[PDB]
Design an enzyme around this catalytic site. Structure first.
Site, PDB file in Angstrom:
ATOM      1  N   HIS A  70       0.838  -1.193   0.000  1.00 23.25           N
ATOM      2  CA  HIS A  70       0.000   0.000   0.000  1.00 23.25           C
ATOM      3  C   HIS A  70       0.880   1.253   0.000  1.00 23.25           C
ATOM      4  O   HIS A  70       2.078   1.197   0.276  1.00 23.25           O
ATOM      5  CB  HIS A  70      -0.946   0.009   1.223  1.00 23.25           C
ATOM      6  CG  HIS A  70      -0.246   0.225   2.533  1.00 23.25           C
ATOM      7  ND1 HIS A  70       0.195  -0.817   3.328  1.00 23.25           N
ATOM      8  CD2 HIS A  70       0.089   1.363   3.193  1.00 23.25           C
ATOM      9  CE1 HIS A  70       0.786  -0.331   4.407  1.00 23.25           C
ATOM     10  NE2 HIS A  70       0.738   0.989   4.348  1.00 23.25           N
ATOM     11  N   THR A  72       0.480   4.902   1.767  1.00 27.36           N
ATOM     12  CA  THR A  72      -0.350   5.628   2.721  1.00 27.36           C
ATOM     13  C   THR A  72      -0.473   7.087   2.300  1.00 27.36           C
ATOM     14  O   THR A  72       0.504   7.665   1.826  1.00 27.36           O
ATOM     15  CB  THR A  72       0.269   5.579   4.113  1.00 27.36           C
ATOM     16  OG1 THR A  72       0.256   4.222   4.557  1.00 27.36           O
ATOM     17  CG2 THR A  72      -0.540   6.459   5.098  1.00 27.36           C
ATOM     18  N   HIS A 149       5.342   6.662  -0.863  1.00 27.32           N
ATOM     19  CA  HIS A 149       6.182   5.478  -1.051  1.00 27.32           C
ATOM     20  C   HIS A 149       5.379   4.211  -0.815  1.00 27.32           C
ATOM     21  O   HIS A 149       4.280   4.266  -0.259  1.00 27.32           O
ATOM     22  CB  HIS A 149       7.321   5.491  -0.028  1.00 27.32           C
ATOM     23  CG  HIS A 149       6.846   5.376   1.387  1.00 27.32           C
ATOM     24  ND1 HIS A 149       6.435   6.465   2.128  1.00 27.32           N
ATOM     25  CD2 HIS A 149       6.696   4.295   2.193  1.00 27.32           C
ATOM     26  CE1 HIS A 149       6.052   6.065   3.325  1.00 27.32           C
ATOM     27  NE2 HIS A 149       6.194   4.754   3.389  1.00 27.32           N
ATOM     28  N   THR A 151       6.347   0.726   1.259  1.00 31.37           N
ATOM     29  CA  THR A 151       7.327  -0.008   2.073  1.00 31.37           C
ATOM     30  C   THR A 151       7.449  -1.454   1.600  1.00 31.37           C
ATOM     31  O   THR A 151       6.436  -2.137   1.417  1.00 31.37           O
ATOM     32  CB  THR A 151       6.893   0.012   3.524  1.00 31.37           C
ATOM     33  OG1 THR A 151       6.889   1.377   3.964  1.00 31.37           O
ATOM     34  CG2 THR A 151       7.849  -0.842   4.381  1.00 31.37           C
TER      35      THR A 151
END
Length: 218
Positions: A70, A72, A149, A151
Site C-alpha cells: 500500500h 499511505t 512510497h 514499504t
C-alpha cells in the site's frame, strides 16, 4: 456515539500489482547485495561486518508486508492523529473512497533501515495527499507528495513509517541533480550510491501499479 476514522487512508495495490512490485523489490535486494559497489561499502551499511562474508539483504529486511502492498496518504490513528478529521472530511477524500487509481513507481531504494519504492503521484492523486500544519524539517524544499512510497522491508528494530523519512532524506540528497554518476547498471535501471548506506535504483521505465483508495482499520 461518534464514528472513528481509519487507522490510515491510502492506496492498496491489487493482488497482481502487489506481486509484481514485491518481486521487483526482491530481485533488487538480491542484485544489490551481490553488486561489488555495495559489498565494498558494507561498513557504511552495517557495523556487523566483523565477518568478511556476504550480507543477504532479503534476510536483512526481515520484516515485510505479509500481503497486499500500500501507499499511505494520511495516518489517522482512528482520529487521534493531528489533522486526521480535517483530512477525512474533505470532499475529494469522500468522493474518491473506494475508487481505483494507477500509481507510478520511479525508483527503488535501500538504506540501513528500510527498503521501499518511490511513488510519483499525478496531479489528481496529489489532491488526496494531506496538507498538515507540520511539514517536517525532512520534507522542506521538496515538492508536495515527495514522501509517497510503498514499504517493501524494514530492519528488525525499525517501524514502517521510517520508510517515508528515508525516502525524503534520499530526495534531499539527490535534489540538485546531485545524483552525479551511477556506480552501475542493473537490468531495470541505473544504480546510485548516495553514501551513509543509501542506495537508489532509478527505473529506466517507471512501473505502473493499480490500487484502490480506501481506509485500513487494522
Amino acid at each position: 456515539e461518534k464514528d472513528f476514522l481509519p487507522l490510515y487512508f491510502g492506496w492498496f495495490l491489487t493482488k497482481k500489482s502487489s506481486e509484481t512490485l514485491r518481486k521487483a523489490g526482491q530481485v533488487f535486494l538480491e542484485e544489490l547485495g551481490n553488486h561489488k559497489a555495495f559489498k565494498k561499502e558494507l561498513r557504511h551499511f552495517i557495523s556487523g561486518d566483523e565477518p568478511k562474508e556476504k550480507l543477504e539483504l532479503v534476510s536483512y529486511f526481515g520484516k515485510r508486508p505479509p500481503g497486499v502492498l500500500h501507499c499511505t496518504t494520511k495516518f489517522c490513528d482512528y482520529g487521534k492523529a493531528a489533522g486526521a478529521e480535517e483530512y477525512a472530511q474533505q470532499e475529494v477524500v469522500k468522493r474518491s473512497y473506494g475508487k481505483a487509481f494507477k500509481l507510478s513507481i520511479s525508483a527503488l531504494f535501500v538504506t540501513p533501515k528500510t527498503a521501499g519504492a518511490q511513488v510519483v503521484l499525478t496531479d489528481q492523486e496529489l489532491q488526496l495527499w494531506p496538507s498538515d500544519l507540520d511539514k517536517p524539517s525532512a520534507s522542506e524544499g521538496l515538492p508536495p507528495g515527495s514522501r509517497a512510497h510503498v514499504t517493501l522491508g524494514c530492519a528488525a528494530d525499525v517501524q514502517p513509517v521510517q520508510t517515508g523519512l528515508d525516502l525524503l532524506d534520499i530526495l534531499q540528497q539527490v535534489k540538485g541533480g546531485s545524483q552525479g554518476e551511477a556506480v552501475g547498471e542493473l537490468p531495470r535501471g541505473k544504480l546510485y550510491s548516495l553514501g551513509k548506506g543509501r542506495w537508489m535504483l532509478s527505473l529506466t521505465k517507471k512501473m505502473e501499479v493499480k490500487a484502490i483508495f480506501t481506509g485500513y482499520y487494522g
